[PDB]
Design a protein around this motif. Structure first.
Motif, PDB file in Angstrom:
ATOM      1  N   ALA A 163     -37.318 -41.833  14.461  1.00  0.00           N
ATOM      2  CA  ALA A 163     -35.958 -41.630  14.963  1.00  0.00           C
ATOM      3  C   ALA A 163     -35.030 -42.729  14.414  1.00  0.00           C
ATOM      4  CB  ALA A 163     -35.935 -41.613  16.464  1.00  0.00           C
ATOM      5  N   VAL A 164     -35.519 -43.976  14.374  1.00  0.00           N
ATOM      6  CA  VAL A 164     -34.746 -45.079  13.797  1.00  0.00           C
ATOM      7  C   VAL A 164     -34.468 -44.848  12.317  1.00  0.00           C
ATOM      8  CG1 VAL A 164     -34.695 -47.571  13.258  1.00  0.00           C
ATOM      9  CG2 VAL A 164     -35.715 -46.743  15.430  1.00  0.00           C
ATOM     10  N   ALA A 165     -35.500 -44.447  11.585  1.00  0.00           N
ATOM     11  CA  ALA A 165     -35.351 -44.154  10.174  1.00  0.00           C
ATOM     12  C   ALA A 165     -34.286 -43.072   9.931  1.00  0.00           C
ATOM     13  CB  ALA A 165     -36.680 -43.724   9.588  1.00  0.00           C
ATOM     14  N   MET A 166     -34.263 -42.040  10.769  1.00  0.00           N
ATOM     15  CA  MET A 166     -33.323 -40.924  10.552  1.00  0.00           C
ATOM     16  C   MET A 166     -31.889 -41.357  10.844  1.00  0.00           C
ATOM     17  SD  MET A 166     -35.223 -37.400  11.851  1.00  0.00           S
ATOM     18  CE  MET A 166     -35.712 -38.030  13.461  1.00  0.00           C
ATOM     19  N   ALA A 167     -31.704 -42.051  11.960  1.00  0.00           N
ATOM     20  CA  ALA A 167     -30.392 -42.560  12.361  1.00  0.00           C
ATOM     21  C   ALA A 167     -29.805 -43.502  11.308  1.00  0.00           C
ATOM     22  CB  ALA A 167     -30.494 -43.282  13.716  1.00  0.00           C
ATOM     23  N   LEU A 168     -30.631 -44.372  10.753  1.00  0.00           N
ATOM     24  CA  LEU A 168     -30.146 -45.321   9.744  1.00  0.00           C
ATOM     25  C   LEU A 168     -30.192 -44.741   8.343  1.00  0.00           C
ATOM     26  CD1 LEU A 168     -31.822 -48.687  10.893  1.00  0.00           C
ATOM     27  CD2 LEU A 168     -29.599 -47.776  11.557  1.00  0.00           C
ATOM     28  N   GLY A 169     -30.815 -43.578   8.201  1.00  0.00           N
ATOM     29  CA  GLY A 169     -30.899 -42.913   6.912  1.00  0.00           C
ATOM     30  C   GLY A 169     -31.770 -43.658   5.922  1.00  0.00           C
TER      31      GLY A 169
END
Length: 188
Positions: A77-83
């Motif tokens: 989820a962190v990876a997706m939010a920060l791209g």
């Protein structure tokens, strides 16, 4: 026919409305998922044959690796939010399955730091209610489709890829068959 229900794909008994066009599920604990990412580049080869107007979605799952499995879903989820998906996927996979240097949330965090995301930025994301709903989405999408195994790909909430019914003599032939199936189902 050349593409047959129950052969290169199965059909969901109960189709999921409003589902992402191309939805892929994985776990960093999942061994074929490792292959799919590092050796086969499935996601990438699917994209290359997909029409355009098409969004691809990739979600992590909780049911492998217990406590660390859930941490990994929040980190994704962190990876997706920060791209930053494309900077952490490989070291997460290798940290979990190859070197086994990931054993806690702090070790997951180290992977991001090494990939150049800043401490403050990672921890803020980690704790954000944007990541919370992002985690909820991953869970809801998995819950929607009966998911008990990964890797898994779903097309328009109706069809599910069946890699067991394709050739594995040749990895390259396997990949194109897989991607052409996604394209076929896409147009369906």
């Amino acid at each position: 026919a050349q593409y047959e229900d129950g052969k290169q794909y199965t059909t969901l008994e109960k189709p999921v409305a409003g589902a992402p066009q191309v939805l892929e599920f994985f776990s960093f604990f999942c061994p074929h998922c490792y292959q799919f990412e590092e050796v086969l580049h499935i996601s990438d080869n699917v994209k290359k044959k997909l029409p355009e107007g098409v969004k691809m979605t990739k979600y992590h799952v909780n049911f492998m690796g217990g406590d660390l499995g859930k941490d990994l879903t929040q980190a994704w989820a962190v990876a997706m939010a920060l791209g930053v998906e494309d900077k952490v996927t490989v070291p997460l996979f290798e940290g979990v399955q190859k070197t086994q240097t990931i054993r806690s949330a702090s070790d997951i965090r180290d992977v991001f730091i090494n990939a150049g995301i800043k401490g403050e930025e990672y921890d803020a994301a980690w704790n954000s209610f944007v990541v919370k709903s992002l985690v909820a989405q991953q869970e809801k999408a998995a819950a929607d489709v009966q998911l008990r195994g990964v890797p898994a790909m779903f097309v328009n909430g109706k069809y599910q890829l069946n890699p067991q019914g394709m050739d594995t003599s040749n990895m390259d032939v396997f990949v194109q068959q897989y991607a052409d199936t996604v394209k076929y189902l896409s147009e369906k």
